[PDB]
Design a protein around this nucleic acid. Structure first.
Ligand SMILES: [Ca+2]
Ligand SMILES: [Zn+2]
Ligand SMILES: [Zn+2]
Ligand SMILES: [Zn+2]
Length: 90
DNA sequence: AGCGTGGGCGT
DNA sequence: TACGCCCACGC
């Protein structure tokens, strides 16, 4: 039970948000607006944070390293590493 | 497996 | 406002 006065008025959408920007971000799912552009491949994206991880597909940057002993696996995204770590154990 | 992308939060 | 982090789901 929170204060989320920013309601999405799109048809049949009953989502609400705590700050105006989070609502505007969500609304791009309805409109398909993609304000951000990768300058390497020209692809456009709805979100700068998703643009940022996309660009690691060009640079090869892999900031997330497996902690398992003798494993040298690295990943671009933290969720990729979570999935890998779940694999060592089961 | 690698990564688009939606929603939850943050400084 | 800018600019994310993490998680989850779905190809
Ligand atoms: Ca509504
Ligand atoms: Zn909506
Ligand atoms: Zn690109
Ligand atoms: Zn590993």
């Amino acid at each position: 039970g929170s204060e989320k006065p920013y309601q999405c008025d799109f048809k049949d959408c009953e989502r609400r948000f705590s700050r105006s920007d989070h609502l505007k971000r969500h609304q791009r799912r309805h409109t398909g607006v993609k304000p951000f552009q990768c300058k390497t491949c020209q692809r456009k994206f709805s979100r700068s944070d998703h643009l940022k991880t996309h660009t690691r597909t060009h640079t090869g940057e892999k900031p997330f390293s497996c902690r398992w002993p003798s494993c040298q696996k690295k990943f671009a995204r933290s969720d990729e590493l979570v999935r890998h770590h779940n694999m060592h154990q089961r």
